[PDB]
Amino acid sequence: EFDNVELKDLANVLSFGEAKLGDNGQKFNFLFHTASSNVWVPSIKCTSESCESKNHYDSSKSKTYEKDDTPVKLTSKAGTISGIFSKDLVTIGKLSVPYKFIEMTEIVGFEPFYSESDVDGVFGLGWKDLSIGSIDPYIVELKTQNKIEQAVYSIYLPPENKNKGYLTIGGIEERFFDGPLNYEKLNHDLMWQVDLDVHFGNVSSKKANVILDSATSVITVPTEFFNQFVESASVFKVPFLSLYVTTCGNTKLPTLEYRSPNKVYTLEPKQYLEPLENIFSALCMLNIVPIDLEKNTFVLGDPFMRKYFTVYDYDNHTVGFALAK
Amino acid sequence: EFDNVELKDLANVLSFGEAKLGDNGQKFNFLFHTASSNVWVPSIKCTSESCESKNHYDSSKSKTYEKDDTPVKLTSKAGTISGIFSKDLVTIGKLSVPYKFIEMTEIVGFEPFYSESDVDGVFGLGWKDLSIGSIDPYIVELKTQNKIEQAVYSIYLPPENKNKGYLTIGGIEERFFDGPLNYEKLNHDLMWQVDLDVHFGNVSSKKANVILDSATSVITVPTEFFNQFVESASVFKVPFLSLYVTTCGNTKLPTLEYRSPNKVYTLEPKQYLEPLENIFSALCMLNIVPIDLEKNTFVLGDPFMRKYFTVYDYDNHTVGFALAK
Ligand SMILES: [Zn+2]
Ligand SMILES: [Zn+2]
Ligand SMILES: [Zn+2]
Ligand SMILES: [Zn+2]
Numbered sequence: 001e002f003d004n005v006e007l008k009d010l011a012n013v014l015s016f017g018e019a020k021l022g023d024n025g026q027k028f029n030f031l032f033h034t035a036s037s038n039v040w041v042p043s044i045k046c047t048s049e050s051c052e053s054k055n056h057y058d059s060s061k062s063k064t065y066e067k068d069d070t071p072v073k074l075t076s077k078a079g080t081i082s083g084i085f086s087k088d089l090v091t092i093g094k095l096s097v098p099y100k101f102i103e104m105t106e107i108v109g110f111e112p113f114y115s116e117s118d119v120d121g122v123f124g125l126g127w128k129d130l131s132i133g134s135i136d137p138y139i140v141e142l143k144t145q146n147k148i149e150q151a152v153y154s155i156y157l158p159p160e161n162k163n164k165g166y167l168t169i170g171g172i173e174e175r176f177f178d179g180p181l182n183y184e185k186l187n188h189d190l191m192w193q194v195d196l197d198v199h200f201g202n203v204s205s206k207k208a209n210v211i212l213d214s215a216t217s218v219i220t221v222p223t224e225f226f227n228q229f230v231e232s233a234s235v236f237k238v239p240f241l242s243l244y245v246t247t248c249g250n251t252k253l254p255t256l257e258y259r260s261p262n263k264v265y266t267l268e269p270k271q272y273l274e275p276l277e278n279i280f281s282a283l284c285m286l287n288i289v290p291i292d293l294e295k296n297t298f299v300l301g302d303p304f305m306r307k308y309f310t311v312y313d314y315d316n317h318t319v320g321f322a323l324a325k
Numbered sequence: 326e327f328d329n330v331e332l333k334d335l336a337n338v339l340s341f342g343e344a345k346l347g348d349n350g351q352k353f354n355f356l357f358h359t360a361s362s363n364v365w366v367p368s369i370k371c372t373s374e375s376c377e378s379k380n381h382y383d384s385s386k387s388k389t390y391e392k393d394d395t396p397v398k399l400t401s402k403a404g405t406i407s408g409i410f411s412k413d414l415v416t417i418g419k420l421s422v423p424y425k426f427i428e429m430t431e432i433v434g435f436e437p438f439y440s441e442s443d444v445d446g447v448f449g450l451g452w453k454d455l456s457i458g459s460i461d462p463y464i465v466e467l468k469t470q471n472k473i474e475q476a477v478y479s480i481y482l483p484p485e486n487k488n489k490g491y492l493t494i495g496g497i498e499e500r501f502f503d504g505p506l507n508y509e510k511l512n513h514d515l516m517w518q519v520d521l522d523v524h525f526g527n528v529s530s531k532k533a534n535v536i537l538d539s540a541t542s543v544i545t546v547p548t549e550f551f552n553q554f555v556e557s558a559s560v561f562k563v564p565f566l567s568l569y570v571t572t573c574g575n576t577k578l579p580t581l582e583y584r585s586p587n588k589v590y591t592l593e594p595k596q597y598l599e600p601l602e603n604i605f606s607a608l609c610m611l612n613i614v615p616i617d618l619e620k621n622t623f624v625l626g627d628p629f630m631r632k633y634f635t636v637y638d639y640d641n642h643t644v645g646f647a648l649a650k
């Protein structure tokens with residue numbers, strides 16, 4: 001019975017969708033992001049070159065708008081973004097609640113990928129403690145105002161990368177997975193992150209912090225971890241043509257295991273290799289990028305999510321996993 | 326006027342499209358491949374697992390069919406594909422012509438990517454000397470049965486990965502590009518390859534063999550060359566976090582320059598950087614990959630073709646370039 005919005009592919013990442021703001025259901029294309037905690041839309045007031053082609057929010061055209069206007073500034077190396085807090089009806093699907101978001105006023109940097117893109121802004125589905133201004137998560141607010149029974153959502157990406165993906169709010173659709181769904185405890189309520197013991201052949205990392213991130217097409221691993229593997233690889237004749245390039249038929253590659261106390265999650269080469277050409281390619285690239293984000297931290301993006309249906313439960317502070325069907 | 330087939334996105338590669346086979350115009354999804362010289366389609370007589378949701382070719386239901394049945398088999402490390410030669414009407418757009426091609430009977434390996442893919446086979450568009458069975462290129466054959474004036478084709482990918490792209494046959498639509506187009510002579514009539522002098526900051530490789538390949542989303546570079554480049558990147562503090570990862574706001578990276586006797590073609594960081602996430606991404610990947618394919622050989626994939634509208638002229642043994650607009 002639940003609420004399902006369709007997700008679309010943009011750059012090997014399938015978590016883009018439509019959501020509406022205000023009385024007059026103004027439309028935007030959002031990147032639905034499990035690892036951030038605000039919603040961002042371009043304001044009509046946006047003076048910047050990148051805002052041109054975008055959908056705009058116009059508070060004057062919506063009767064439900066509630067002036068807030070608290071200024072916001074997020075400076076990063078890739079660019080900067082300023083804007084204001086506004087309140088209004090925010091709608092995904094047949095679900096609609098009054099909600100505080102950020103109208104983007106100016107946007108320097110982040111070029112050219114922002115203007116080159118068909119996506120207007122980001123719709124965070126992370127946790128409160130991470131959000132600018134301590135705003136309750138959107139799904140929690142739906143629950144607070146009895147629009148849905150449980151503060152849960154799920155992400156289904158299809159295993160053969162052709163069909164439609166779904167973001168579902170309010171309960172669990174049995175039709176997305178086979179087998180039992182297993183729950184893991186959130187280690188802390190910042191992001192959607194769990195303690196797992198990560199193994200990749202001979203290398204391992206006990207008590208790793210594993211972050212789910214819908215918005216990346218990549219699997220990440222700390223530098224030291226990847227160095228360890230390169231060492232195991234160098235020794236016993238694991239044949240590479242460059243650091244990240246190998247044959248698509250490479251039997252001798254190890255399986256990435258993420259082990260909880262109750263369940264093992266795996267990515268076989270078949271899942272962490274992208275081919276250099278669509279079909280009939282001799283050559284394949286490791287879709288694993290080594291990056292030090294934070295001590296002992298690993299990220300799971302789409303390759304993991306193309307295999308595992310995932311459930312995000314605020315009520316219970318848990319993430320659920322199961323094989324997608 | 327000239328005949329135009331639309332191209333669709335799959336995995337950052339925009340060279341997939343529609344071609345018909347035979348009397349009853351059986352539809353397929355082809356990877357139009359400029360670096361191979363046969364057309365391959367899955368036969369109805371195809372046993373294998375991966376063939377199963379693929380659009381098939383059926384001899385018997387096409388009266389223009391002309392048996393050949395010559396045994397063909399290609400193995401690579403990625404897998405095996407065998408089939409038989411067959412000849413029949415091969416149509417793209419309005420242009421139509423009897424062409425010898427390959428029906429794939431068995432196909433081992435090339436998984437999962439083949440069966441996960443919505444494309445059926447590869448429509449070669451290279452040269453005769455590279456094809457199996459010494460077959461005249463398709464567009465050459467179009468000229469041979471006086472279906473087109475000139476045995477030229479062109480590929481347009483749009484500068485902003487927004488709109489659609491086109492494979493245009495027999496002519497040069499000038500709405501696609503700006504400035505003159507600049508022709509380069511083929512070093513060898515095998516692939517569409519040219520002699521260029523490659524520069525990347527302080528590293529260069531004179532008289533490099535440079536291949537144009539529509540099927541790769543990547544720029545490729547000899548292992549040595551990339552090594553020099555990273556060594557260069559060492560000495561004058563270019564801020565790398567890992568070996569292919571840097572900030573998206575890093576302007577201190579060199580332009581990549583492909584210099585011919587008459588013209589210099591360039592890729593800016595703007596063009597060889599791909600962000601880790603689709604919008605507002607702090608980090609970026611080097612879309613340049615090292616691989617020794619052959620002496621001093623460099624491959625130009627989609628990152629290049631998105632900036633350069635390209636023209637492939639059999640009549641003249643040349644490749645032409647101009648800024649896509
Ligand atoms: Zn402007
Ligand atoms: Zn906390
Ligand atoms: Zn362990
Ligand atoms: Zn993210």
Ligand SMILES: [Zn+2]
Nearest residue numbers: 522524529531
């Ligand atoms: Zn030079």
Ligand SMILES: [Zn+2]
Nearest residue numbers: 277360538540
């Ligand atoms: Zn190719």
